[PDB]
Amino acid sequence: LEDLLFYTIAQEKIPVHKFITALKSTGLRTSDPRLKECMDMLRLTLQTTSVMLDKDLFKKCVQSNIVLLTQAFRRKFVIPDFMSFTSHIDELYESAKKQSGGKVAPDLWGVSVCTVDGQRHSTGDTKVPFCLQSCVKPLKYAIAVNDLGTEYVHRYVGKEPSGLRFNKLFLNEDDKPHNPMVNAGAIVVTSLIKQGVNNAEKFDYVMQFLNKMAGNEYVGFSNATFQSERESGDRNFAIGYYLKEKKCFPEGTDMVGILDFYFQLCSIEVTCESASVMAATLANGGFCPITGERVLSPEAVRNTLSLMHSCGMYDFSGQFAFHVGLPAKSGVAGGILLVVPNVMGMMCWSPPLDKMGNSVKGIHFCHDLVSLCNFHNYDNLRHFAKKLDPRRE
Amino acid sequence: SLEDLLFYTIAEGQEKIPVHKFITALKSTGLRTSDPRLKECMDMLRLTLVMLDKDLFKKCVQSNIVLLTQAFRRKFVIPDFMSFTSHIDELYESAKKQSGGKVADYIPQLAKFSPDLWGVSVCTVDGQRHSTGDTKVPFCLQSCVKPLKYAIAVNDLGTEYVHRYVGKEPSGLRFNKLFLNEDDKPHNPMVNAGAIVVTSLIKQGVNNAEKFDYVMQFLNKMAGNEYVGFSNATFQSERESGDRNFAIGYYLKEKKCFPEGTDMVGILDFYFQLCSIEVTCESASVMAATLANGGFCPITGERVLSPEAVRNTLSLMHSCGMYDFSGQFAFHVGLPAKSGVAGGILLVVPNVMGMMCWSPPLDKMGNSVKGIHFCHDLVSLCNFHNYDNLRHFAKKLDPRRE
Amino acid sequence: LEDLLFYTIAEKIPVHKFITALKSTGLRTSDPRLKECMDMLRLTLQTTVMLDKDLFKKCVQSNIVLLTQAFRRKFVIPDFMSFTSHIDELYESAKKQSGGKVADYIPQLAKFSPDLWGVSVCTVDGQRHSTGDTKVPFCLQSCVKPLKYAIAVNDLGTEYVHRYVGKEPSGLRFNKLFLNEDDKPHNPMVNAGAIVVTSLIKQGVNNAEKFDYVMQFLNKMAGNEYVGFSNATFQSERESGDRNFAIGYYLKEKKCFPEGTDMVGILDFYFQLCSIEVTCESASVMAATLANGGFCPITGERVLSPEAVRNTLSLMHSCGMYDFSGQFAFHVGLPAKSGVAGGILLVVPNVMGMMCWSPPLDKMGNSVKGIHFCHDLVSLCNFHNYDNLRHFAKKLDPRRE
Amino acid sequence: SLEDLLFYTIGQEKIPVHKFITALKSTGLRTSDPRLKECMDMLRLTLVMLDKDLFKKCVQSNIVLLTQAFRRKFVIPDFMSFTSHIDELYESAKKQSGGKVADPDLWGVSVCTVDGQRHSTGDTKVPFCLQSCVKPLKYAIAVNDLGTEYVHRYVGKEPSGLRFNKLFLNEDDKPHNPMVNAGAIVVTSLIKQGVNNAEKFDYVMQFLNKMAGNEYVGFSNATFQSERESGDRNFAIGYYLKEKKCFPEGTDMVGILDFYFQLCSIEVTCESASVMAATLANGGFCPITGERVLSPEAVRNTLSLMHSCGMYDFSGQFAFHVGLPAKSGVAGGILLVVPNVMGMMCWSPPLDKMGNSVKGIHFCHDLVSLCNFHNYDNLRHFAKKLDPRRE
Ligand SMILES: O=C(Cc1cccc(C(=O)O)c1)Nc1nnc(N[C@@H]2CCN(c3cccnn3)C2)s1
Numbered sequence A: 001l002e003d004l005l006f007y008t009i010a011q012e013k014i015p016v017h018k019f020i021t022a023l024k025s026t027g028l029r030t031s032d033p034r035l036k037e038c039m040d041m042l043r044l045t046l047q048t049t050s051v052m053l054d055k056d057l058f059k060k061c062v063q064s065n066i067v068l069l070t071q072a073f074r075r076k077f078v079i080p081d082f083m084s085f086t087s088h089i090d091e092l093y094e095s096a097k098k099q100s101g102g103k104v105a106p107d108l109w110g111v112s113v114c115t116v117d118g119q120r121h122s123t124g125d126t127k128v129p130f131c132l133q134s135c136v137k138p139l140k141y142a143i144a145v146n147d148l149g150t151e152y153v154h155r156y157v158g159k160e161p162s163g164l165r166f167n168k169l170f171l172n173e174d175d176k177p178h179n180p181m182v183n184a185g186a187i188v189v190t191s192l193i194k195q196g197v198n199n200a201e202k203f204d205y206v207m208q209f210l211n212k213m214a215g216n217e218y219v220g221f222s223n224a225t226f227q228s229e230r231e232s233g234d235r236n237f238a239i240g241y242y243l244k245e246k247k248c249f250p251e252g253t254d255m256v257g258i259l260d261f262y263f264q265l266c267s268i269e270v271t272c273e274s275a276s277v278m279a280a281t282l283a284n285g286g287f288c289p290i291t292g293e294r295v296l297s298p299e300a301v302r303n304t305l306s307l308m309h310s311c312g313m314y315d316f317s318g319q320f321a322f323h324v325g326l327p328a329k330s331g332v333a334g335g336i337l338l339v340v341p342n343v344m345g346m347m348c349w350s351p352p353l354d355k356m357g358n359s360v361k362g363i364h365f366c367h368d369l370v371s372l373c374n375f376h377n378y379d380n381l382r383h384f385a386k387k388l389d390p391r392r393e
Numbered sequence B: 001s002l003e004d005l006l007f008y009t010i011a012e013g014q015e016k017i018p019v020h021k022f023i024t025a026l027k028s029t030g031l032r033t034s035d036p037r038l039k040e041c042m043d044m045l046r047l048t049l050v051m052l053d054k055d056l057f058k059k060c061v062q063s064n065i066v067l068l069t070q071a072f073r074r075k076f077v078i079p080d081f082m083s084f085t086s087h088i089d090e091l092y093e094s095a096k097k098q099s100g101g102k103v104a105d106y107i108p109q110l111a112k113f114s115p116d117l118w119g120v121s122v123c124t125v126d127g128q129r130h131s132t133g134d135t136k137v138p139f140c141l142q143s144c145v146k147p148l149k150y151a152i153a154v155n156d157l158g159t160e161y162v163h164r165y166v167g168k169e170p171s172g173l174r175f176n177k178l179f180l181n182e183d184d185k186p187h188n189p190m191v192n193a194g195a196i197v198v199t200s201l202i203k204q205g206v207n208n209a210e211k212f213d214y215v216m217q218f219l220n221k222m223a224g225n226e227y228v229g230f231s232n233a234t235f236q237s238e239r240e241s242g243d244r245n246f247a248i249g250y251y252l253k254e255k256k257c258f259p260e261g262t263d264m265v266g267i268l269d270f271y272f273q274l275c276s277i278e279v280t281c282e283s284a285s286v287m288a289a290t291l292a293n294g295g296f297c298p299i300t301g302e303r304v305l306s307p308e309a310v311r312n313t314l315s316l317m318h319s320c321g322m323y324d325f326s327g328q329f330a331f332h333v334g335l336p337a338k339s340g341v342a343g344g345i346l347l348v349v350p351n352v353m354g355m356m357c358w359s360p361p362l363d364k365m366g367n368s369v370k371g372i373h374f375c376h377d378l379v380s381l382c383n384f385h386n387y388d389n390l391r392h393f394a395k396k397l398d399p400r401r402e
Numbered sequence C: 001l002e003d004l005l006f007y008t009i010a011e012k013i014p015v016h017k018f019i020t021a022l023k024s025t026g027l028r029t030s031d032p033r034l035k036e037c038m039d040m041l042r043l044t045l046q047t048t049v050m051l052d053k054d055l056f057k058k059c060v061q062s063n064i065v066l067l068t069q070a071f072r073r074k075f076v077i078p079d080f081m082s083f084t085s086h087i088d089e090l091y092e093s094a095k096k097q098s099g100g101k102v103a104d105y106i107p108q109l110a111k112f113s114p115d116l117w118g119v120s121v122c123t124v125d126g127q128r129h130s131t132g133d134t135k136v137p138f139c140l141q142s143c144v145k146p147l148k149y150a151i152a153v154n155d156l157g158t159e160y161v162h163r164y165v166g167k168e169p170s171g172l173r174f175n176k177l178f179l180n181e182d183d184k185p186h187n188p189m190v191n192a193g194a195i196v197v198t199s200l201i202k203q204g205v206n207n208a209e210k211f212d213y214v215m216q217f218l219n220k221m222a223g224n225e226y227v228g229f230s231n232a233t234f235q236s237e238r239e240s241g242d243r244n245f246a247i248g249y250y251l252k253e254k255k256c257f258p259e260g261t262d263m264v265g266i267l268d269f270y271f272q273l274c275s276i277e278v279t280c281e282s283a284s285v286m287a288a289t290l291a292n293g294g295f296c297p298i299t300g301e302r303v304l305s306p307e308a309v310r311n312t313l314s315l316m317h318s319c320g321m322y323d324f325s326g327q328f329a330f331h332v333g334l335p336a337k338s339g340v341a342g343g344i345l346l347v348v349p350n351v352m353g354m355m356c357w358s359p360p361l362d363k364m365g366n367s368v369k370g371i372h373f374c375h376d377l378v379s380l381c382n383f384h385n386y387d388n389l390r391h392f393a394k395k396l397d398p399r400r401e
Numbered sequence D: 001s002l003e004d005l006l007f008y009t010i011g012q013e014k015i016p017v018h019k020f021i022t023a024l025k026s027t028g029l030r031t032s033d034p035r036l037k038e039c040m041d042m043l044r045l046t047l048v049m050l051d052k053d054l055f056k057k058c059v060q061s062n063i064v065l066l067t068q069a070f071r072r073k074f075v076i077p078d079f080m081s082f083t084s085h086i087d088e089l090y091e092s093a094k095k096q097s098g099g100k101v102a103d104p105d106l107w108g109v110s111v112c113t114v115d116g117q118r119h120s121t122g123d124t125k126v127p128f129c130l131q132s133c134v135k136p137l138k139y140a141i142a143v144n145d146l147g148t149e150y151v152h153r154y155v156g157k158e159p160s161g162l163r164f165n166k167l168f169l170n171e172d173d174k175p176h177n178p179m180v181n182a183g184a185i186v187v188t189s190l191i192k193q194g195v196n197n198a199e200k201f202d203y204v205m206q207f208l209n210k211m212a213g214n215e216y217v218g219f220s221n222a223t224f225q226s227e228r229e230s231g232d233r234n235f236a237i238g239y240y241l242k243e244k245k246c247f248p249e250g251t252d253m254v255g256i257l258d259f260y261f262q263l264c265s266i267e268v269t270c271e272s273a274s275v276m277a278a279t280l281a282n283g284g285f286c287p288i289t290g291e292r293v294l295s296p297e298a299v300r301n302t303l304s305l306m307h308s309c310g311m312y313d314f315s316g317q318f319a320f321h322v323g324l325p326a327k328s329g330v331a332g333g334i335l336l337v338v339p340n341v342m343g344m345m346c347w348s349p350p351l352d353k354m355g356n357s358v359k360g361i362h363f364c365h366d367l368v369s370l371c372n373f374h375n376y377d378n379l380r381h382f383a384k385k386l387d388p389r390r391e
């Protein structure tokens, strides 16, 4: 298997740089956690002789990681021609870049891609930290369903868009918040997680869960955003008191403590790069693609994607489901967390928002992405007219 | 050569293949001997008529060799079809025990149907077929026709024109009491007001008899020429008790929701006719499979609908297709479906198969009790939910795999 | 007594002096209750311009009760001349407000000059005053809604009528919903409620007889002044009545009609009732019948039961001015009903009826000049439902010397 | 002279004091009436037989009021016959024993006419909290001090219609009216702005004392503590209004909520509350003191909104059948105004499903079935009703 792969890259010896170039062109990064042993071995070899790899040295280096390297080089990844795909991503990025309207809650614009096989691409401002805000709502819902199951969670929150052209009603007709993607629903979801412990431990628990979803890439916290959310959270206090009065919380809930935790969760920071990996975990059935670790149950992921599909883009949710047909979640910092199930996760970020509250550039990019590729939920992988299918050669 | 390869597969060391042995093997892939794409092969077999040498076999199968090769090399979307239909039969028998609900009675033609009629038909995107129960009994599409006529409208007129007159979203728990959204358009094509507007868009400028003929011809193609009929007795009854639909018609007219030059009372007549179109589970499953197969009819290979028409139809069936149960159905079942008052549920598994489930008794939401029960069990068993993962699906079975 | 009254007006009374004094009370010489007196005066000017004690007694004796109340300043508004002078000033002030749009949805409405403006007053004692265009016929339209509701309650009682229609404003939900939560039209003053009310009247006879019955009832309310019919308005209403057909089918589906109703026949009758014509003068008498507990003030006949009148006034108060109803109830505080021809039927209970008419409508559908006049009227006089009769700051109380 | 005329009406040489007192009470006035203070002081100084001269000395300072009383010029001339009807209505409502006390057999009705004629039956001297019955009173204070235009920049003027009171704000982002909780909360924020809550409360208490002609007004600290501990719905309203900028600039919203709970906890008796209602019936003048308490504008606006908005979700039915401005509260009080005639307070703790006192609702319907008091009854033609304004 090491030999087979040796011949593919070879003709007596392989220069190390040639192996690295070929590896990167598959879309994997040399820092990928699943390539740690291989890359450690290569570094050790460049020490123990001072740039050329025979059959035997090669086998020694790649043997621990041979399954993944074989899939990579045999073009078995979900997107086999990754270089051609990222060239299209860059063109969509540049086209969205020209849409400069909208209002910040301005010129920063980044897009990151992580496939379900861990292939990575970034364009623009993808290493700048920003708060998740409402992008965290699907993530904490997934955690709640993961730990508690669908039946328990949906005793407290509903499963459908309100329809009302406003977040204006807090409760559906059964006295539950409409869904986990609206503020009242996210507040109730927050109350379900890790009940019985203090806020510091609840927060640590959620942070550890997000670290795993992001394959240990950047997850941080903006104390400045937290302070500001809590000082202008009058609408959220209104929701909290309303839910308390209507008995919407689990028995023994400290409602004002839950609101504080809620503001903390909104203030969690990511980059486009780290958030794309979180989205890829959702695209990959709850397994983190760059570590192989099982993070969320399949039930948690399926429910989260269903509700992002119908409820994730504020009052634009219905239009977005129809035209784009992908589970997505927007936030006021300008983030759009986007999932292409079975294919990839993305995070798009540009601060200026349209009248609906959605990033202008991200919305434009999402429409162009589905115009180009047969990724709409109800596109037919068989016949798709003029679209490109990046899953094929 | 391809015919020879296939000859050896069926021959298994023998010099000649008995005809019955070829037919049995063919049926076990899921294809029917009547499949329109196997016409030349079956014609040749009839001309030959009970033993087939290499040469005679090649003469018979040569015109249809591509399809027969895919069949016998287990390349169909569901390779182990026999095992799959065994699961379908178990789900069928389990739903059969759920005999609650009430048959619709508001007209004599609905009230007449036995509560105990129950059929399920499957047609995969490769034309593999299976039926259990009462699958050859005609019943009216009723609201099951709504996605089909919307697909026709989008096919002929494009998304932009159609959605100038009808919206694209569920109204939400505002029930179905409001006829128009805030932009004075019916909320979507799956509610009565939206379907009435859609009906006014089709084949404009010709009389109702020609509009109806056109729609009937279109449904014939979607069904691969299987049973499509018309119930004049249902039509007469719909039209005499259609007070709610007349209220909608006058309301839309007042709010100028129709294309210029519309004869609103004539459109209502056409609407009642379309609701009275009859299918069987068998023929409707093929229509659903056309939608699962990106607009190509799987048992004919004919392009019937544009990709845009099919995608838009499936999107709206997903969110709007099961009356007030639409949101719950989208969440738990996660498949585009459309129910009707005759007890039909038209069900699409994109890229995999179409189905029609039919049982007259309806739940409190208006949906077939047995069909709803079957749809839940189907997705509990198989990784067919829209947001199931194709790689990691816990203990579900994936019928696309060996 | 005739003698007492003789001395009040008096050795001999010139006829012209008796007539001018009579007119200054606000009564008209044509008042039906003065017929015998005026007949006797005309006969006297034929036989034998001067009236001694004896001739006077012969003339006024048949009508002496009414003439005594008139001359002893016992009418509801004793200084009527001073009151009508205020009415005229309010009229002239509203005349300057010439904004709004004439209704155009049918040719018969679109036709009316924006500048037509009339106000007529009829007190509960039959005192009359008109200013401006008060003898021009126009269709009641929605102004007929309280009148046919009153007829229904008169003939059938409150409990029967309110089995089919509700008793409350829908709330600023506007009038997009045809039915309340109990599947009844919200009240008799909205189109769906008026359609159901129409189905209750004179059931079991044909439309021609239903119409004749309503017309005879309106004639009595108007003390036999002008009540007519605009066939041209009727034809136009019926050919563009799409919204009303929508309501009719909706009500039929929801079983809102009395058993055996011919819904399309009811719609036809509904359009006929909307096309009934009045003048400001004749409609003010209809409003005065409602102000006077169901007795027509110029004939003394009782047109409607006390129950019918009370219920009609209650619903005009809360539901009568379309989406402006709540604002109108708060600021003006009088039962009123508007219509798309520019009419405002206005009732001051225990005091008077009025009809204000000016075609140009505001954005709510109410006559701009009529609305302006109604506000000024209550700013000036202590007529608001919740003004006090004893302590009213700087308002004038016309029912007081 | 007026004292002499009155002397003759009450053909002896001398009037026993008891005979003057019993005749006075039969007009409906009480001997403690503040407007009869000088007369009753003089009688006490005199103390049992009164000649022409002594009588004149006693009644002279109050002679105008005593003349109206004895000449049957009061709004209800045959008061004794009227109170006999009130007692029958009282006994008939007494038999309606359903409903649930807010989480019991007490029943009182008090009448005060616009002329200060008084009658009570049942439990009319037991203190209970106004609760929502305070809403029209504080709205009247706000309009009195600030005018209609300013107040209605912050609160609307109409019933919401909506199934219940599920929406806090109308389409213009104002609470629908002053009689719903959100509207009363905004009204509370308008009163005596810029001073602390203790002074705002003192000011309102002084205003209520005048409306009640100085009869019983108290405060239930126990009710206040309970309202604030379970006021989650009111905190939701407060935060919602704050977010939508519904309060005057510089408002301390949590302080306003505290004041709101205090105002709900003010105590009255049926007797003292009937006088407050009579102030509203009498154009803003307190009938038993003659003092001007509220502007005519404040009173008219208050009565208009009580008419359409005062009886929770029963308001539209009540307006149609009863046709009188009224305001109910969760302690079982119904404050009722018959404009130009009288105020009443009905109190019985058990409430119907709408939140209204069962006995009070029954009494209000019977009162208008009997008498031509509906706002759209006619004063000349009224079928078989009794008109208590006539002899
Ligand atoms: O109708 C129901 C379901 C429900 C909620 C509570 C009780 C029931 C029941 O009757 O069982 C039903 N939902 C509701 N959700 N939220 C409501 N009110 C909140 C606070 C006030 N508000 C608005 C919005 C716009 C304008 N003004 N105020 C939104 S009402």
Ligand SMILES: O=C(Cc1cccc(C(=O)O)c1)Nc1nnc(N[C@@H]2CCN(c3cccnn3)C2)s1
Residues within 6 Å of the ligand: B174, B177, B178, B179, B180, B181, B182, B183, B251, C176, C177, C178, C179, C180, C250
């Ligand atoms: O006002 C909007 C626009 C719109 C659309 C979606 C939501 C809203 C909203 O209420 O916020 C408004 N649309 C409407 N569509 N249909 C309406 N009325 C029809 C006939 C009468 N009717 C009913 C229903 C129940 C009871 N009574 N009559 C249905 S009015």
